[PDB]
Structures are given as structure tokens and as C-alpha cells.
């Protein structure tokens, strides 16, 4: 919903990544939730990096890293300690 | 400058010789073209040629019909020319028998293509259509040719036939039994703000009122169900922004002593119509009212 | 029938004096209201003397005057008045009768008269309990001010006393448009004024709803940074006391409907342009005009 | 059913015609069998084909 | 300096419809009141000859067909445009100075130049629309070739066996001669094909015996027309049959004037009957045969001699016609240069 | 404006259009294929990856997500494919059917036969007989008379077949296509009017003269259906006989070589090896067209 | 349909008419626009309204 | 029979190439401050109106009341302006940046994007534009003026980048920004302040006035209206008089943007799209 | 001299394709003309062309 009513540097690739993001339905078996949530995450991070108006690596073959966009680092180390504790 | 030129009678603009005649007689030649009376010289019907496909020329061989143009967002046709009779499908005011009749006559590709184009965008019809006037001639090949009249009367060349504008009976609308001496005729498009049935109401109003404030004041009080429907769709579905609950525009004026009834015939499919004989065209833009 | 004839011969059925025809020949190229549009009308329909009800409702007379036909006067001879009907956009002059000063480049409007009394001394054709009262031709600022003040008096007269509305009548009726004073003759609450108030309040609620976030808080944002005389003149007429979301494809439709609603509001007081003077006479009695009717 | 254009363009004799009632009454009450009463003037009668 | 030499204005070469050889297929008739009719019909009362039959045979009945045949109209238009500066310099002098005479004479000469160009364009468009209307009523070669040979069999309505033979010979003659002059350059075969073509189509019903007569009393049967280079191929290959000589042509259009009696039936019954006085005379007398067509008497009465190409073949002298002059420097195509799709 | 009118006063036909001299071929006179992805542009394989793989391996660009207004225009009519970069040869035009590999090629590729599968001559039936004509076209319990098998291509000669739904225009409207594209197979499959054209013989001749031809935009590198006035109609004998001519065709370059070497009218004969074969060019328009001069 | 009695009673122009096919073949296949084939001897031309 | 032709003289020596430049602008529109008879070129067009600190809206308010003349002929030391009347039809050049079609309604606009030039004079002619692009430009410019104070953020620069361009048939055209150096011009400041004032007074007084009217509610319409206003919402009377007069004066200071009168409607354009035929309308 | 009627506009793509095809046809046949053929009528036709 937030990506519909937003102006971008380019409309077509934003619409394409948003089209990958929405209509996302998980299967019942837990094996193929991971790749679908990963393609949802890479679409969301592409919308994030382009909506803040900074470059993404457009090299063909390498995917963009799943990371938080423009955060204060105390919440980031909070995320690292929480994610390591659940590791 | 001197007193004789202002004391002379004005020069007859018709009885003086034509520019071709005063070019010929000063040099004294002859040509096979008969010249001495040019046609269309004493004309005020401001014509405009128009090209149309075959699918939109039905109900137009008989002269007098509204050649209302539209625009599609697709770039290859920038405009198209709908007739008023072809707009009756999207007209909610058209009865189901009449709609089933006039859908059985426009079964070419262009008419239904325009019908699909009308109900596709995020806009209403008043920012989709544009009125031109009345058609008087037709060439009728495969790609036909129409000559509309923007301003003036509706007459044949050499003034021998005053053409007449017909409108279908399901779009005619008068508001007082005591019709005035001179009366004007406007193009009302109202909107019922139902969800699925957002198909508008088409009306051709013929009233003696020429003012604009006293016309929209008596127009609010004759569409109060649709006005309350606009407020109802405004309140039950918020964060959607509709506009222009009704739109009017001045189409012309008639004499009120010859607005009568008739019937169009087109491939033996008759249709009862309201006929306006001595019609004039004086356009106004699409104004709105809430 | 025959169409709208260019000439309407008004015939005075009474006997006449000499001085009344002396006043009548001064009133050439003036405006008259005609309801009939025949060829050989009498003098009863000529002028607004057929419309003086026992209330003289000014909003009622204002609504009725636009429904009539504006017509020009020509050829004042013995018991003949050649009324030239108007046509769309030609150029022929006028002659004002009210004491309203005119300038160049402005528009004009037809209106019922003002400060109606014999202290003004209208020398307007007294005969047979019939006075030919003429419609005033006023420019657009005076017409807009009198319409907005009449609508303010209509909207203000709801749920208030019979002394505070009189305190508003004695305050509001004075107009000082271009160094001249004009009062409002007998303004009454009326059903026509009531339905115009109804449409006005509905349009006011529609602009109250259709306004977006920034479209309301822009003056509150501007009062934090810029400071002018206009902002201190208007901000003490408002109340006393980083956009969170913004979507221009929504605001475009918001303002698209908002201009429609503001048109629907402002059309109730900006009636119709009926004359646009190109140039005037220096004594400010006549003027060359465009677009008769 | 009848070219009334062929009534005006041809010449015709002049006869003092007297109806029992008024002529518009005997017109509009269809004592005659086919009538083409029109007001004003029509240019229908001129364009002969 | 630069040397501007004499300016060159192209003289518009002129071509009129009657002085061109294409008018032999036509019958030029002028008629001022053409803007007031719907159709020109032409009726025929054709009695057939029957023949006595023997014993037991079915006896042929005395029957007679009747057939109407109408006209086709196609009006021809040209726009030409004038600037308003040309108008305001045409009808208006500017203090009579020497700088007004140049513009006034220029405007008048431009107007008359455009008028002469428009008249020549109207003549060429008349030629073009006449050739279009003639070509629209032109069956191809193989159909009239099969019809001139198998007409003596199908004397009843067409059966299935006869239409089967007609379709087989359709395919045969179509596969024979789609491209003839490109294929063979035989003199005798091309001449035999052309005289078979000349005897193939039938003549019209009326012809003025004084028109289109050459010197030494030779009578023209028809006109053939083609483009430039195939006419060059005919003139280089069939050169032993081209007697380049003069011919007679109608000088002007014959006129067509309705009678004072014709206006009465024009107004009342909405119709026009030509040769009206001769019709009432021959009806009152009782001799039921007119001396001539109504439309034949309305033709021309004056003739002009002019040089053209006539070929003799099967003693059917026909005029060969080249159409380079009519469509040179024009903006339309020749109507004689089509395309063929062999799928 | 000059109103003219002609009266065709000939009783029989009085004018004949012979064909004389051919000099140029505006088509390529070669072998390409009709771009069926451009004909029907909005038919996508329902799984996404197989569609991208097919469109990439066929050498055809994506439809660029044509919006529904442009889609409605494309159903109304539109030119999609641009002209090529350069062309010494003529305009491209060809087509494709689906054939059974054991069809009677000796009777069906050496003589002119209709590639629909049966003898579809509209003239051979009785006039005004739609039932008998549609039985001659669509039924398969009677044999046609040209080839006495009832069928020579069961994928092509039955109602509702492959080439029907690919080439009958009535079936092609239900799938949606570029109507500006020309398809040379549809003239053998337009049974919607082949039924409507089985008139009497002279009526068939005049129906062959007007409106039986086709219009082709000559300037563009691909073939387009024109409009009348921009280009004249193009006369076509194959619409009359409902046949098509057998151009020569080798299946091995040895046969093309021994056809090229001998010459002197050695083109109309059909020479058949074990698996290889040539069919005779029926009219020698590849033998002496260019070398005549 | 036209007045074929007017074609029969009125005088004509004697023409050596000839065309390429048989007359009845051109009649039954409608080479022309509108035709009329009375086969015996119609009395309809001797009636005038 | 000469017509109304305003004689427009010049005040400067021109070359033959200057007249050859000027004779290309025959069928174009020219704004004139007063329907005069003899005029110089200093009162010919819009360059007499162009102010450094006043902008588009103040040019448009001085554009509603101009006689939109044409240029019938040009000759030695003079121009022949041609005043049009409502009813006739005239040829208008396609001097606007955006093309037209057959049937559109055309109106006037100031030239947003950038002819004769002198030392102090530059001949400038107004844009003639169809009505939907005119309304689109109005609603673009008012909203772009409304993003003036909050210009410092990083998203709204992309938002006004999106708002800066418009789209017509093959016209991917963009406009200049109304705000210069991060502070609004006083013209667009008044234009946006009027909108904010009418919104802020409508959201304040309409509730009181509709609940005053609700006792005399004689329709099924005003009750839905006050229910709508109630669902949104979750002193001395001279203040009320002043507030209502302030409402109507901020409405009166706004009518340059709320509408546009149709001036020309095309009838047929020239091929290659450089001129058209238009019936003039008031 | 052969393709002159068809250039009624500025000549488009397919017409100059035909022109180049006729270039290739004519340049190879009519290159050394008196060395291939020595018929009198062919040199006559070539000289008048």
C-alpha cells in the first residue's frame, strides 16, 4: 500500500519489484517459504534503496544484500544480539 | 475622407461582382467554369469536415445528430466521433427495450470499441467527451466524411432545406408545461453514484431559462436523489475523491413552436424521436454543478 | 412563429406631456428589462415597475432581474421607443443612470437599484401610478461586494436575536465603493436566499472535507517562518493554536475536485458578465461597450 | 402522397372561395381528405428533383 | 556579383477531353441542368426470334424480355486556394502609385493563372473519372474469350455442366495468357490475339455515322489504350499495320435542352422524357419507330480533323492511344498501371 | 465541382482489360515466415518461465505490456512491426499451414489446387444455394470433383480445424489480431463470404470487378492492409478460381542444380527422385521474366 | 418496378441489337440490373390508369 | 471595405532580415492592454508586463482582460493588427509548445518555457493551449507552490520532480519551478494562502452554521452533510462578521485560478501542424 | 526511363529497392553491348533508347 502512492526515480522497475513483492502466498510445507520470503525481501530492499535515492549495484549476477536501510547503530546491534540469541 | 464617400449608400456585398469576375473582366478571357454566382457566399453556417469509419455512420444518413467527439488515452486514435444515438448504451436513462433495439444496429467494430473505451479510465464522461454540434451531410463510402456545423443554422446549400436535429425520446426532458416563446436547449449529464452502476444519466433539457444560476438552482432540485447519492457514496466510501455530480453546457436554442415528434428509420428499425426543426448551434463548455 | 426580432417598438398608451418626453429623450442608449419580446409591446412590461411586490425582496428582485431580457433604447420620438435587442459580442455604446463611477477595462453587471428614496430624486417618468425604474449597471467589484454582503446577512441571520441582527443591519449596509456611499434597500430573509444559503453551506462542508493535510496546515506552517502584515491580519482571524505522509497522485485529484467545489461556491455570488467596456467618456456618463447581452 | 410542390409552381385559376365555417376550422377538422397546412413559408416547394 | 539569367516559367501544356483520342469510347453531351436528376435510365423491349419445331418436339413459345439499365454518377472536385493579401491587392488600389500596379497585375495574373490551371485540372479529372468508370465495367480477357466461344451452347439458363466447362476454360485461358507480351514476341500471334480481342467485345447500340470517320471513308470501330512503353512495343513489333493518319472528332459537346413541355412533367410527375414532341407526333400518327435516338440527336454537329494512330486488323480499324500527356507531372497514378497478385 | 454521370449504353460488355507487360516484383519472391507472434500479440504461456524461454529462443521481443486502450485499438486496427533496417529485395510476405506428410503430392502440388484441402470453387454450385455450397465446403461424406478424395489435408479442410481457427477471419476475430496485417491464406478460408458470393455468372463477374480485390500499403517493408484512396485496389485472379499456383520447389540442391544447368524451358516438368522431387513451375515466370528485356 | 406498358406502347428506336451471349442466358443469369420476362402474351399493356 | 485594423507603428530602424523574421508571425495572437487605434510596440505583447518579483499568476490576472488581436499584415514601418469579434473564424498559428487536434477548446497561458529582440525590447507571444493541459498546469503549479516551505526534505524533491513534468500526446514537457531560492514569490504565496485560508475557515465555521440550519432542514440532504462533518471532526458576533467577510475576500482573491474561459475552438488544423482555423469565442 | 511514373511522391524504400534491382539487372547485361550482340535491330533499339 505504501509503495502505490509514492514517487520514484523510475516507475517501471519500481512497479516490477512491487509486482514481485505483492501477491505473495506461502505454501503449506515449510521448505519453500524461505525462497519466497527471500524474493519478497530482495524486492522490499530494492524499493528501500531506490526510495531513499541512493544507488544499488546494477551488476548482473550479484544480488543486493539484505540489510537495514539508514538505521541508528544501537538498534542494529540490538538486532545482531537478538538474531544471534535466536541462532 | 470627403463627404460623398460617407454620404454614399453602402456597397451591396452580393450584387457587386466576385473577385474572379473582376479579375476576368479586366483582362477579358473565357473559361469553362461558370463563375458569376459563387455558392456558399451568403452563408453563416460555419462548417468543419470530419472523417469517420463505417461503424459510426449508422443513424447518420438522415441529417441532424450530435457529433460528439471523445478521446482515448491510446496514442494511435487521439479522438473519435460518437453520435448521440450511440451514447444511449452508457445512458442509464435509456429504457431497456430501446437499448436492446439500438444495440441491434451498431454491431460493427468501431461502435463497441468506443463503448469499451468509454468505461475504462479513472475519469467520468465530462472530461472524456467533447461536443461539436450537428451533422448535415454524409459522403458514405467505406470511410465516410461528415460536415458538422459549429455555429449557425442547419441548412442545405442554396438554403432550400432547413435541416433538423433529432434526439431520442429517452434523453428528452422538459420541465414546465407552459413553454416559453423562445427557449434554449442544454446538455445535462448527471451521475448516479452507485458503485457498479456508475453509468451516467443523459438528458437534453429544453427550457426557457437562459441564465446560469437560476438554471443550476432548479437543476439541483430535480436531481436531489442523485445529489444525495453523491453524498452517500462520499460518506460510505471515504478516501475516494469523486467530483462533478452533474454537468451542463449550452447546446443551442429553438423557436418552441416547432419542437415536435418524429421517428428515425434506419434499415426499417424505427425509433421515436424529438425533432427540432429550426435549430441553432451556440456552444458552451462543460460547466458543472453539485 | 417569427424569430427574435431585432426591433421592439414600445408604445406609450397614455397621453404625454412635453417635459416627460424631454426626460425620455435623455435616456437613449440605456438598458431596460423586457419579459415579452413581441414587436409592438405596450409600456406596462417596460421596466421593473411590474415587479414591485409589497415586500420588495431584494434577493427576490435580484433573482428575477436576470431572468428578464436586457435591451437597449434608441430613437426616442413621439410615442415610439425603438428597443434594439442585443446580440452576442457586437460593439455599441451605453448610458448609465446610477451615480456609480466607471473606469476602463472592467466588466459590468445588471442589478436592482440602491438607496431607493426621493432624497436621491429619481426623475423617472411619473405618470398614472407607474414609475419607470431602471436597472442599475454596476461594475464587478461593487456587484461582488453587494452579493457577498447579502449572503453574509443571509447566513448570519440563523439562530440569533431580533436585536443583534439589527445591529448587523445597521453596520453592514454601508458600502464605500470608490468614494461613494450606497445603502442596501430593504434586505429581507427569503426562501430564495435560504436555498442559496443551503447550497453555500453544503459547498462549505465539501471544501471542509476535500481539503487534504497540507492544504489546511500550510498557513500554520507559514506562520512559523515568514511574517508579514497579511499574515498578522488573517492569522488573528483564524484560531490560536515535516509532512507525515505525502502522495501527489492523490493531491492532484484532491485539488481537481476542490476547484470544482470552489467554483460551485463562488458561482453563487459572481453572477454573469453582461458588459465589458473598452473605453469610456471623460464625464463618466456614457461608455463604448462590448458583448451586449 | 402528393407533391404539394407541384401545386405552387404550376399556374392556377383565381376563384372566390367561400367555406361554410372559418377556413382553419374546416382545415383542422379534416373535412378535406389531404391537407398540408403550414405557417410562414417553406423552401420545400423549390428544390425540384 | 552573381548573374541571374532569365527566369523560366513552365508553359502548361493543354489537353482537352474531345481532342484526346479517348473520347471515341465516350459520347460527349453537355447538359446544364444536371444538378436536378437522380438516375438516367435506358429501357429495352427485346423480342426474341423463335423457330418452328418438328413432331413430338416441345414447341418454343413466343416470348419477349424487357430490361432497364441505369446511370452512374461520380462528381469531380478540385480545391484551389487564395491568400487574403491577393484579395486585398486585387480589388483595392493603393493611391494609384507605381508600387500598386505591380501587385494588382500580379494578383490578377495569379488568379487567372490558377483559374487556367484549375480548368486544365478539371479536364484531366474528367478524363480520369471517365477512364475509371470505363475500367470498372471492363471484364478481363479470359472471361470474354470463353464467353465468345461457348455462347452458342448455353442458350437456356446456365446448367451445372455448362458452368463446369466455363470454369475449366476459365482456368485454361487464365493459365494461358496472364503475361502475353512479356512471354512471346510473335508478330502473327499477337496480331491474331488482338483481332480476337477486337471481335470479342460487342459494339454499342448507337453511333453517329458522321463522327470518327478518317480520310478515304474508313470508319473507326473502337479505341484501345495502354501506357507508353507497351505502346512502343506494339509500334516496334506490329509496325506493318499502323497507318498514322488523320481522323474526325466532334468539336464541342452536344447540348441537351429540355422542352417547355418537359418542365411540366418535371414539376408535376418528377420526370423527364426526351424527344417529347417527336413522341407525341409519332404517337398521334401511329408510326411506331423513331428515326433516331433522343440521345443521338443531342450530340455534336461540328467536326475537327486531327492526326492519330489507327491500326487495321480484321478490317476493324481501331485507334491506339497513349496516355503520357494526361498524367505527366501529376500526383496520382495511371489507372492503367495496376498490380497483380498471383498467390 | 462538376457533377458528371455515365450511362453504360452497351448491351453486352463493351470493354476488355487485357494484361500486357510485367516488369517488376515488389515482393521479395522468396522465403520468410509470417510473424504470428506479432499477429496475435497478447497470447502468453500461463507459466512465466516457459514463456520467457520460448520468446527468447524464437527471436521475438516481448509485447511491452500493451495497455488495454492500446489493446482495444489493436483490435480496431494498428501497425505493430517497424520496417526493417535495409532491404535490397522486396516486401516480405509468406504464410504457413500444417500438412499431413503423406498427402497426395502428385495431384496436389503439380497442378493449381486450393490449399484448404477441397475444391472450394464458389462458381460450381447453383446460385443462391447456401446449403449445397456449405455442404461442398464443410461436409466429408461427399468428395469434391477436382480431386476425388474427399480430403487432402484433414488438419485444414474441416470446419473448426487448425488452419480454420488460424486463418478464417471469423475465428480470428474471436482470438484478436492485428487487422492491419495481411494474411494471404485467408482468401482461401473466408467461408463467411465464400457462401455469400456463389451468385450467377455475370453477377460473379461484376462482383469480381468491384470489392473482390485487396488493398496493400506498398511503401512499408511489411505487407499492410491499406485504405481506399491512399492506394488503389489490386486485381487478383486467385479470388475467382479459388486456386493457387505451384511455384517450383526442390527438396535437395542437386535438383535445383540440374534445373539451373539445362534451361531452355526445362521448368514445367516434375522430376521425382526417391525422397526428393521438384514440381513444375506452371507459368514460366522464373524462366524468362528477367532475361526478356 | 417501372411501367413496362410504357415500354411496350410507346414508339422505340429500331436498333440492330447484338451481344455476345444468348438472350435467355443473359436473362436468366441477370446480366443487367432489373429485368422483366413475360412469356406468353400479356394483356397488361392494354390497361391504362 | 476595410475592417478594424489597429495600426501598430514601430520606433526603431529594422533591417530587411528583421521584417523577414517578423513576416513569419502572421496568424498569431497578441495581447493588447487597451482597444486603441494607433500604438507603438512597447504596448505590444507581454514583455511590458513581465516583473522580476511577480510571476505566473499575476501575469494571468492581467491576461483575462486583454484584447487578443491578430497580425493581418506587415509592411513598411507598420503592422496591421486585427481585432477579432465573437462569431467569426480566423487562422491561429500553432505557436504554443504543445500541438492540437480537431475539436479541442483552446485558451491562453503565459509562456513558461522560452521572436524579435531589441536592446530593451524582446517580442514575446503567449502560449495557446488546449483546455485539459491548461487545467493540468493550474493544478500542477498550485500544488508545486504548496510544497514550498517543506522543500528541505529528500522525498519531496523527488515528489516535485514527478510533479514538474506533464504528459500530453507525445509531449513529455516540464515546467519551471515557482519557488526560487527556497522562498516563494509573493504571487504564488497569495495564491496558496487563499486556498489554505478558505480550507481552514471551511473546517471551522461550517459545523456551527449547519447545526444552526438543521432545525430548518427541509431536505434529506443537509442531514447527511452534517453527519459527514461530524464524522470528520473526530464569542462576539463581529468576529463572525469579520470571519465571513475574510472568507469571501479570500475567495475573491482566487478567481484567476478557479476557471478558464474558452477562447478558441479549432475546426481544422493545417497539415504539418503549424496553423489551424478557430472560431473565436468570448 | 522505365520507373518514372511511380515517383509521384519522394520515392520510398521499396521503389529504390526496385531501382537497385534494375541496376543489377541492366549493368550486367548492357555492359559491353557491341561485343555480345551485333544484330542491327538491337543496336537500333539501343540507340533510340
Residue numbers in the entry:
A (entry chain 1): 89 to 175
B (entry chain m): 1 to 290
C (entry chain n): 1 to 241, 255 to 306
D (entry chain B), G (entry chain Z): 1 to 49
E (entry chain C): 50 to 392
F (entry chain C): 1078 to 1370
H (entry chain o): 3 to 116, 124 to 243, 259 to 306
I (entry chain D): 197 to 245
Study authors write:
Through 3D classification and refinement with C5 symmetry applied, we identified the portal vertex and resolved its structure at a resolution of 4.2 Å, revealing high-resolution tegument densities similar to the CVSCs of other herpesviruses. Unlike the icosahedral reconstruction, which showed that each triplex of the viral nucleocapsid was exclusively associated with three copies of pp150, our C1 reconstruction of the portal vertex revealed two types of tegument densities. The first presents with two copies of pp150 associated with the periportal triplex Tc. The other, lying on periportal triplexes Ta and Tc, is completely different but reminiscent of those of CVSCs from other herpesviruses. In addition, our C5 portal vertex structure revealed 10 short (27 residues) fragments of helix-loop, which are structurally similar to each other and are all located close to the portal main body. The 10-helix anchor contains 10 aileron domains arranged with 5-fold symmetry and appears as a helical ring surrounding the portal. The C-terminal loops of the 10 aileron domains consistently point to the portal wing domains. Through hydrophobic interactions, the helix anchor is tightly held in place by the capsid floor regions of the P1 and P6 MCPs. Each of the 10 fragments of the 10-helix anchor is strongly associated with the capsid floor, and interacts with the pDNA. We surmise that perhaps this 10-helix anchor—unique to HCMV—functions to dampen this squeezing/tightening process.
